[PDB]
Amino acid sequence: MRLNVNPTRMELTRLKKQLTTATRGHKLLKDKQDELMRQFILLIRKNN
Amino acid sequence: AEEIEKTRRRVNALEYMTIPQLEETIYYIKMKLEENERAEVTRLIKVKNM
Amino acid sequence: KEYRTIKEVVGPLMAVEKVSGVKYEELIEVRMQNGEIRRGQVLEVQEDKAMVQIFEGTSGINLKNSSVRFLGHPLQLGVSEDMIGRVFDGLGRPKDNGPEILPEKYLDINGEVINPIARDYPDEFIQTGISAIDHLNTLVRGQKLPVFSGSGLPHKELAAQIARQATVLDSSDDFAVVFAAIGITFEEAEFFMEDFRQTGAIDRSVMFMNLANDPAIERIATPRMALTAAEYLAYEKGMHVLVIMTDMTNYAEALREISAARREVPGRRGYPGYLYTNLATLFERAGRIRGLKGSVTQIPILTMPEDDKTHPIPDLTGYITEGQIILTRELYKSGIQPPIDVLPSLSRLKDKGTGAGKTREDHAATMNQLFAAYAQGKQAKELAVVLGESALSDIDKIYAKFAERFENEYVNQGFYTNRTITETLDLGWELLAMLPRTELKRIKDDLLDKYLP
Amino acid sequence: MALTAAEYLAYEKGMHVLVIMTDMTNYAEALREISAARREVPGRRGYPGYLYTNLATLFERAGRIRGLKGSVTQIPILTMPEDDKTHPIPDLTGYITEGQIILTRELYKSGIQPPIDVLPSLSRLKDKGTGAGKTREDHAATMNQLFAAYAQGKQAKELAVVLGESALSDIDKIYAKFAERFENEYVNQGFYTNRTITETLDLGWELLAMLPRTELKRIKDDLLDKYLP
Amino acid sequence: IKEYRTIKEVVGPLMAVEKVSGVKYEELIEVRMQNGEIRRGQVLEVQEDKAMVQIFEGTSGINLKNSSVRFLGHPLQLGVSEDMIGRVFDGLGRPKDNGPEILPEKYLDINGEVINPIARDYPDEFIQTGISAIDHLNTLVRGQKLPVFSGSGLPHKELAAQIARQATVLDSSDDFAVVFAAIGITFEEAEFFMEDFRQTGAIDRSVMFMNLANDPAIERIATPR
Amino acid sequence: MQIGKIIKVSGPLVMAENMSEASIQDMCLVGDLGVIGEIIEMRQDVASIQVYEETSGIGPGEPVRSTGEALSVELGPGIISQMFDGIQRPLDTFMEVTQSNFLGRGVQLPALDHEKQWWFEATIEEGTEVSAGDIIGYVDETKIIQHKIMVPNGIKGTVQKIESGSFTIDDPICVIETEQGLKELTMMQKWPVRRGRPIKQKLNPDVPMITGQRVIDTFFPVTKGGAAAVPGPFGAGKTVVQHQIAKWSDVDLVVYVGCGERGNEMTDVVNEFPELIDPNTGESLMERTVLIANTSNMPVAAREASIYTGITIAEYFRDMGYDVAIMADSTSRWAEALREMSGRLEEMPGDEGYPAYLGSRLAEYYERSGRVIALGSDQREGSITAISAVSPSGGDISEPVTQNTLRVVKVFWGLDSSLAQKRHFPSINWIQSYSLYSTEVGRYMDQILQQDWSDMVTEGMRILQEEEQLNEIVRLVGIDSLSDNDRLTLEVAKSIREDYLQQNAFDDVDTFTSREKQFNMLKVILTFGKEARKALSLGAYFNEIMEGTVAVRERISRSKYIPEEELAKISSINEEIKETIQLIVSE
Amino acid sequence: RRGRPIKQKLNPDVPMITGQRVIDTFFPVTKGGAAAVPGPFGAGKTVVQHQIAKWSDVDLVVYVGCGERGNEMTDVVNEFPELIDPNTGESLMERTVLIANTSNMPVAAREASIYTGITIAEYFRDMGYDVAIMADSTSRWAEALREMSGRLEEMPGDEGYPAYLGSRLAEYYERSGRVIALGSDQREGSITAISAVSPS
Amino acid sequence: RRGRPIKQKLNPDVPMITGQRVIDTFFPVTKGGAAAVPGPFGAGKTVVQHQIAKWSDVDLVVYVGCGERGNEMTDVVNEFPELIDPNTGESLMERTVLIANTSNMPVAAREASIYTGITIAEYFRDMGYDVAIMADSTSRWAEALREMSGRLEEMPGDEGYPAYLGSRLAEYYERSGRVIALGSDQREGSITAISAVSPS
Ligand SMILES: Nc1ncnc2c1ncn2[C@@H]1O[C@H](COP(=O)(O)OP(=O)(O)O)[C@@H](O)[C@H]1O
Ligand SMILES: Nc1ncnc2c1ncn2[C@@H]1O[C@H](COP(=O)(O)OP(=O)(O)O)[C@@H](O)[C@H]1O
Ligand SMILES: [Mg+2]
Ligand SMILES: [Mg+2]
């Protein structure tokens, strides 16, 4: 839960940018998950 | 259905592992340079008082 | 009155004994045994002695057979009407091989603090020729708008491009451009002087040049000279002046050097404890004054160490200057010229120079529309490369097509391509025309059909 | 005292000396004790500003000289504080010495003997050191291939344990499987087993054999056919 | 008594007195300013004929040539009495409730002495605080050091005052007191306590030492002692 | 006075010998020029001085004259409707005499007008014995303000000689006979800025201040004598908020303190403030306001001593029995100056380079504000309500300045930039904001209004808090699950957001709101969602009511613009909503 | 420590031939340009400078090795006489000048090695030849200055380095570049700086 | 401060029986070995050390209360004399030696407590006995060194601790181990060192 020690200063702000990308990605994949699920449930009822 | 699980894994792995490891690391990194900064400032006062 | 009483020499610092009537920061000059003459400055003076720092170094000095002279005056500048067109050094000495000027009067480069009640706030719009600066983050007279760059981001081209294209509109007052250069490589210095010569801007501007190898003690005096010259052109000649300084990061590095010379302990990040105040002393000297038709506007340029705003140099600068223009590595490496990113960029007094009387009546209304649409287009772009092109609603796809067309045709004009305000405004419409008439909720029924293609 | 006795036996008496020094970390600790006692201006972490120089006056005392048959070769051992490579002691040592051999807890916990992480390690004399005449001519191409393969394989394994093995491509799983087998047999050999250079090279090809020829763009094609299994 | 008119120098809150004798470490002093004002201070270190002191109220407004320093020959003390019950004091034991002055039975160093580990007796007795979460799951014991870890805005004020009045000892002990100590708190926070104590009659069972945020920093660290 | 002699000059530090009669923290004029300075240290007769203006041109041998006093201010007629710097230098008077638009070194001049003549009116009768603070007479400086001249501290006795007439501040308008001797009293008194003015007793700020801004007085009220911290990022319109506070709040005077702010922010304060108009009199607000102005390039001490000058002047009118409101902006810029002065003294730094006494220095300030009982047999009470602005580094409230401020204040009005482009005016985040006076104010407004106002506010915040959590979960699965029972509370909260929290301060009615108006307003929206919750539990699905309640949502925000006298319409809105749902409950 | 006088100074236009595809293509340095190679130990800073010294299209090279390994220098003198490459038909030693300063050599001599290698470069520059000077490593010069600054108990700057580090480095680079020599023959001469920086 | 002389050291190869399943099985300690117990407050540093003092198969136990709670030492002098093992008939207090310098006790005496206990442990080690010493806590010892360091105006050092901290620690633990006591008998004794570290 600490990864590894890589002490640098500009690395901190690049990490903050990496954080925002991760949140962006997490956001994108969350409402992608629901839209894939949206059609999945639709097709199950046809499937069964 | 298979791809949901793959995407679900990625979301979970990203939310539980990746992001918290990032946050807790930048804090421990911030604390380090916070201490290092003033650990030098004190030494400099010793240099000043020579 | 030449004293031959040199007691100590440590580093650039020198100690003179058996003196009187010596003042703080008083200029000195030392006559060597060989005859070589070097200048200096009193960094500290006690009851029967004084410490001085030599600009030209301390190499090869015999203490016994050398002498020091006290000139009885601080660093002053020769003020003259015949100053425009010529190139000077950090101290004010000519570098252009021209007729040495006879100054009207000598003034202390420190200047004085302008009375708060005396200050008159700026309204006049100033055109810089750059769309990203003249429309989205508009420059107003007497404003203090900096530029944030990095090592290798074309901040020297933009610096040249501004002064060349910077012009007051209509106003019958002539336009002065006091350029100041701080601790720059020769190529960069030669670049600027040549570029101002050919464009004829040299005859429309004053130049203060300071190379990197030039002594650090005059690197700090370089802006104070320019600002004093700029104040000499605006407040006592009624001219609208624009000041450009580069580099400001170099100013701090040199400011740090003379602090360790005084053996002063640095406050934060290795920079002295008066950095914020020392910056404010030469930054906050800009703007109109009540009763006078003068104008002083500053565009200080600095390179953020490793592209970081939280660094003391651009951070502390933010507390003093109104807004910021930020250049982006990602943009410059994509061929964007100038590589200005408008999202983090800001101008706190932009609305003061917009609207009828100063610019087109849709200036403010348009500005926010292009701005909001850019962010939305960038967000459409980021989701596109993660979910594919088809996941987008095809009008989010046109917002994406808008957002790259926005950078390639609007933001990117070229370092040698001037853009007048009107040409920039209807250009936005031409780009907003891509978007249908349904989303443009920042513009009203007078202006939307009065200008849209 | 050791390095002087080393250069004495090796040069005056023409012997072949191997210098082992541990713990090298405890040496720099001693310097800082005297430095802090002398109220000297401290460098990083309180260590003397002249640490790089003093350390150099030890490590540089090694090599061979013209006319003299003897040799002095030096293998110092230091424990990295905080397990931190960027610490002054391992930093300055790395800048002086001709490479370094690095141990890792991750490998050591995995039961790897010796736990040598081959990626951040380095030798600065491997060039002129090996090739035809002293080794087989494949010695230069094998290591450079194993490097690029392990670099890709290990990173793929990282992605595997978090996103699943079925999230990799077919060639990724080939490298991921290679990367693991690399650690367990090539790196791990036991502390009491002696591998001749021949056996190592032979094993080298065996481990990288399980890859398509088209992917290996770092080995001579004429060299491949001859030594490829 | 010793009265010395010689002050070598004054720097910040720190003062230097010369030509001195019989002065001790942590000894208490009194500064007689030129305007008659009396400020208290403490000896931080003493060497030879020189003693370094620190002034509580501060060194602001002091003329050296016309001020004098008196060394009281005792460390920071407290006047103790059984009549302290029901009373309210400041950080330095000076009365604050504007009631009658107290004639102390004796004076004690606020540093006190360390209990001999052998002579110590393991706590081993129950205290009823009233709060169930404490009295049952995190029981308070007579002689225990049991702290409360809180946060900003959190009702640790309300909890403290509650315990202050609710806490009693079973077995009908006619003698049970509460010493409430306030350190560097705002005016209203202080008034909250002093008002709740009086209206619940808890003041009659308690001794209060109230120190404020604007009060001298030295007074703030001497308050718990 | 004794004259000193400079023996050393190095930057801002100046040491001068022969300063034996001087005191610590004394102000003194340094060098031939006469620049102001502060005595920090003193060994023997050699005093160390921190010169606050640049020491260029200053050298050893030059004189040093001590003022004999620490940094003080002039308190008397001629102070109101004036603009000074941090050390009380009249900026307009400065310009007139020095004939310059600049601030020159070594320029000393009186703060008040000593040549101006005022008409004094003796209300005190000869023979009575006076105490500290007792009013002897008054001078109508500028109505609305009656400048009540009162007896200074350190003197008391029977008054012998006195009657009205036209005098100046130097003229002894009265004579008291203390047992020490016969000392005459001028109508101006001087007082140190780093020492609080004495009082009889400090009381609790329990009486709410009527600002009229709904978001404040209802959820986050500040009492007379309270203290409030406001973080103002750009765009949040912090200036708009400050102006409304200065004008509408039921205080007697206003003290503005600009500490080390931008040059292009300070003259805005200067010129836009006379443009403000005082409602009760219809005249400019500057006739009610004392202003302190400083810029980021002005002397570092003036920037540091700014808030202490203003709070001292505030304590002066506080002793008159008036209610004062001192506004400081920015205190984060003030602390960024206090930090610098520490560095010059080579003090061992605390958090983020700030001094270790930043908290104490801040605590000393805010503790001087509050409801007090002023000295004097009259035992009149006054109040100082402190409004201070902070400018955090990254919007971070964990920074030392903001943190230490909230440690000694009870009200926090968080200005959010995210709400700014949402056109939420005022831009105050109702979630992060808080007020510890809310409960005490609740008991006050419950009684004086004679309604259950506190219950309405408690209900208001509880709904809005639920909106937050709902928004977090409605972010998932979209509107689904419909949760009409939850969805209802959203339409109430959405309403509560617009009707009350939003108010255009430029609209002639939407800029001020008295108590009974606020009560009637919130009562509508509350009873809406209550009667809306009624038809919910009776089996009626509710979008069918959302369409029926189109006719009432047109009036709930028209009530916002409803005039003062016409609250009759702002009462019929409430039993009207009863019949609407009822007519829809029949279906 | 004195810059050799010139008539005036020119902008470096002509690209150099490194032979290294990475730098010759995407990140090129002109004849008389200033290049820096920052990187941790093992990144190949010395290798690069060796590769540039071997196959550069210049007329003379001054490889300055201060504060770095001794074997690295003995490597150069063992091989460079044996390597042959145009524009010279002869060996590379007939083109190069070595200034060796091992890490265990005296510390004060490190600053000397830099200032001597650049003066020799300025010398052949005045002739009209194109010269390239490789400083390996420039960090050692700074670390050398840091000791002497500490031993003098001077008030240090960032990371203990002297506050005059930035000014002293500028003097070294503003003593390079394409210029025209003195006299009136007006020969053009360029000094290219390939500095090796080794950040901790 | 000077360690008692021995003939020679021996390798600790005999494991100690602590009665703690987690320790004796997975992370055992030998007689003469040394073990560190770093942990936050309330983790069980003191409880663990009390268990070793109670059940370990040693001849003597020397417990050091270095700058910790006074009740934790009072708890021992009371309970230990009432803890009898079934074979001897005699209590546990008849094999223990307690050293107690609590937190509020003079800081300088914390270091003395550490050196007093280990020397006593050496005294019975020379009798051929197996001794086990507990230090609780060694952090308070280091905190004592830092206090006197600042008073002596010494220079750091890491985190305020003096530069000689590691040496003092290394010197301390090196005094433990399997030894051959001086004498013709060449009897064997040992000292097992258990130390609680209290990291911030
Ligand atoms: N361009 C390269 N090609 C092949 N191997 C290289 C290259 N650069 C470095 N190496 C390898 O890395 C090692 C480090 O070389 P060196 O230049 O001394 O590193 P540094 O200068 O960064 O300390 C060399 O011994 C070499 O084997
Ligand atoms: N081995 C254990 N068995 C049961 N409880 C334990 C054990 N170790 C610790 N505890 C509990 O944890 C608490 C902490 O004990 P202690 O050793 O004093 O902590 P530390 O010394 O680490 O500050 C004890 O009160 C005890 O209740
Ligand atoms: Mg190298
Ligand atoms: Mg414990």
G44 touches chain D (CB under 8 A): no
- Gap between the Cα atoms of F316 and F324, Å rounded: 9
E60 touches chain F (CB under 8 A): yes
F572 conformational bin, left if phi > 0, alpha if psi -120 to 50, beta if neither: alpha
Query: Are D182 and D150 contacting, i.e. CB atoms less than 8 angstroms apart?
Result: yes
- Cis peptide upstream of residue F481 (ω within 30 degrees of 0): yes
Instruction: List CB contacts of E166: < 8 A, sequence separation 6 or more.
Output: E128, E129, E130, E131
- Give the H or E element holding residue A31: helix A10-47
**F234 CA: distance to closest CA in chain E (Å):** 28
Long-range pairs for C91-94: beta carbons < 8 A, 24 or more residues apart: C91/C218, C91/C221, C91/C225, C92/C208, C92/C225
Q: What is the DSSP letter of G190?
A: E
Pick the residue whose CA is nearest to atom 6 on ligand 2. H44
Residue E13: how many CB atoms within 10 A of its CB? 18
Q: Using a 6 Å cutoff on CB, does residue H140 contact ligand 2?
A: no
Q: What is the DSSP letter of F390?
A: E
Nearest alpha-carbon partner for D52 in G45, G71, G139, B44: G139
Task: Read off the tokens for F223.
Answer: 């009492």
Residue count of chain C: 453
The answer to whether G192 is a known ligand-binding residue is no
Burial class (CB in 10 A: 0-12, 13-18, 19+), D39: middle
Out of C213, C261, C265, closest to residue G171 by CB: C213
Residue F146 sits at the vertex; the CA angle it makes with F140 and F150, to the nearest 5 degrees, is: 105
The answer to whether F234 is a known ligand-binding residue is yes
Query: Are C153 and C327 contacting, i.e. CB atoms less than 8 angstroms apart?
Result: yes
Check CB contact under 8 Å for B32 and A7: yes
Burial class (CB in 10 A: 0-12, 13-18, 19+), F551: exposed
Query: Are H103 and H67 contacting, i.e. CB atoms less than 8 angstroms apart?
Result: yes
Task: Read off the tokens for C41.
Answer: 């400055």
Sign of CA dihedral E135, E139, E140, E141: positive
The HSE-up count of residue H90 (CA atoms within 13 Å, CB side) is: 5
- Give the H or E element holding residue A10: helix A10-47
- Gap between the Cα atoms of H141 and F194, Å rounded: 44
- What are chain H's partners, defined as 3 or more CB pairs within 8 angstroms? B, D, E
- Gap between the Cα atoms of G114 and D204, Å rounded: 45
Domains with residue ranges and CATH for chain G: 1-200 (3.40.50.300)
PDB experimental method: X-ray
Residue C148 sits at the vertex; the CA angle it makes with C147 and C151, to the nearest 5 degrees, is: 120
Residue G133: how many CB atoms within 10 A of its CB? 26
Task: Read off the tokens for H161.
Answer: 């601790």
Q: Go through C409-432 and write b for each residue having 16 or more CB atoms within 10 A of its CB, e for each that does not.
A: ebbbbeeeeebebeebbebbbebb
- Bridge partner residues of C241 (DSSP): C176, C296
Q: Do chains D and H touch (3 or more CB pairs under 8 A)?
A: yes
Three-class SS string for chain B? CHHHHHHHHHHHHHHHHHHHHHHHHHHHHHHHHHHHHHHHHHHHHHHHCC
Calculate how far, in angstroms, residue H42's C-alpha sits from the geometric centre of ligand 4: 7
3-state SS assignment for residue C340: strand
Breaks (C-N over 2.5 A) in chain G follow: none
H150 touches chain D (CB under 8 A): no
Query: Are F202 and F78 contacting, i.e. CB atoms less than 8 angstroms apart?
Result: no
- Bridge partner residues of B2 (DSSP): none
Long-range pairs for D140-143: beta carbons < 8 A, 24 or more residues apart: D141/D218, D141/D219, D141/D220, D141/D223, D142/D201, D142/D204, D142/D205, D142/D208, D142/D219, D143/D204
Query: Are F235 and F393 contacting, i.e. CB atoms less than 8 angstroms apart?
Result: no
Q: Residue H137: nearest ligand to its CA? A: 4
- Gap between the Cα atoms of F140 and F136, Å rounded: 14
CA distances from E15 to D102, E10, E59, E61, E72 (A): 57, 5, 8, 13, 16
CA distances from D226 to D196, D204, F189, H145 (A): 21, 14, 105, 67
Q: What is the DSSP letter of C439?
A: S
- Gap between the Cα atoms of F88 and E73, Å rounded: 45
- Gap between the Cα atoms of C16 and F552, Å rounded: 88
Q: Using a 6 Å cutoff on CB, does residue H198 contact ligand 2?
A: no
Instruction: List CB contacts of F167: < 8 A, sequence separation 6 or more.
Output: F117, F118, F120, F173, F187
Calculate how far, in angstroms, residue D77's C-alpha sits from the geometric centre of ligand 3: 21
Nearest alpha-carbon partner for D58 in D100, D92, D11, D86: D92
- Gap between the Cα atoms of E162 and E197, Å rounded: 10
- What are chain E's partners, defined as 3 or more CB pairs within 8 angstroms? F, H
Between helix H138-151 and helix H165-173 the angle, nearest 10°, is: 140
Query: Are C169 and C125 contacting, i.e. CB atoms less than 8 angstroms apart?
Result: yes
Query: Are E26 and E6 contacting, i.e. CB atoms less than 8 angstroms apart?
Result: no
- Gap between the Cα atoms of E202 and E200, Å rounded: 5
- Gap between the Cα atoms of C59 and G200, Å rounded: 32
- Gap between the Cα atoms of F111 and F78, Å rounded: 9
Instruction: List CB contacts of F583: < 8 A, sequence separation 6 or more.
Output: F548
- Gap between the Cα atoms of F329 and F255, Å rounded: 11
Q: Are strands F157-161 and C2-3 parallel, antiparallel or unpaired?
A: unpaired
The answer to whether F68 is a known ligand-binding residue is no
Task: Read off the tokens for G33.
Answer: 């340009």
Atom of ligand 1 nearest to the CA of G51: 1
Task: Read off the tokens for A32.
Answer: 């992608």
Atom of ligand 1 nearest to the CA of G39: 22
CA distances from F242 to C319, E130, F84, F248, F291 (A): 20, 47, 19, 10, 14
> Considering just the CA atoms, what is the radius of gyration of chain B in Å?
21
Size of interface A-D (CB pairs under 8 A): 5
A3 touches chain D (CB under 8 A): no
Q: What is the DSSP letter of F45?
A: T
**B13 CA: distance to closest CA in chain A (Å):** 10
Find the distance separating the first CA and the last CA of chain F, reported in whole Å: 94
Q: Go through B28-49 and write b for each residue having 16 or more CB atoms within 10 A of its CB, e for each that does not.
A: ebeeeeeeeebebbebbeebee
Q: What is the DSSP letter of E61?
A: T
Instruction: List CB contacts of C45: < 8 A, sequence separation 6 or more.
Output: C19, C22, C23, C24, C26, C51, F8, F9, F10, F59, F60
Nearest alpha-carbon partner for F470 in F461, F458, F479: F479
- Gap between the Cα atoms of F308 and F302, Å rounded: 10
Nearest alpha-carbon partner for H15 in H3, H27, H1: H27
Task: Read off the tokens for C95.
Answer: 């570098």
In angstroms, this model's resolution equals 3.3
Burial class (CB in 10 A: 0-12, 13-18, 19+), F393: middle
Q: What is the DSSP letter of D167?
A: G
Topology annotation, domain C1-453: Rossmann fold (3.40.50)
Query: Are H179 and H8 contacting, i.e. CB atoms less than 8 angstroms apart?
Result: yes
Question: Torsion over CA of C302, C307, C310 and C313, rounded to 10 degrees?
Answer: -20
- Gap between the Cα atoms of B13 and B16, Å rounded: 6
The HSE-up count of residue G161 (CA atoms within 13 Å, CB side) is: 19
Which residue's structure tokens are 């949901």?
B4
Nearest alpha-carbon partner for C200 in C84, C297, C338: C84
- Bridge partner residues of F434 (DSSP): F412
Query: Which chain A residue is nearest to residue D106, measuring alpha carbons?
Result: A4
3-state SS assignment for residue E19: coil
- Gap between the Cα atoms of C336 and C333, Å rounded: 7
- Gap between the Cα atoms of H147 and H141, Å rounded: 10
Task: Read off the tokens for H154.
Answer: 């010494």
Q: Do chains H and B touch (3 or more CB pairs under 8 A)?
A: yes
Instruction: List CB contacts of F498: < 8 A, sequence separation 6 or more.
Output: F557
3-state SS assignment for residue H191: strand
3-state SS assignment for residue F148: strand
Sign of CA dihedral F439, F442, F448, F451: negative
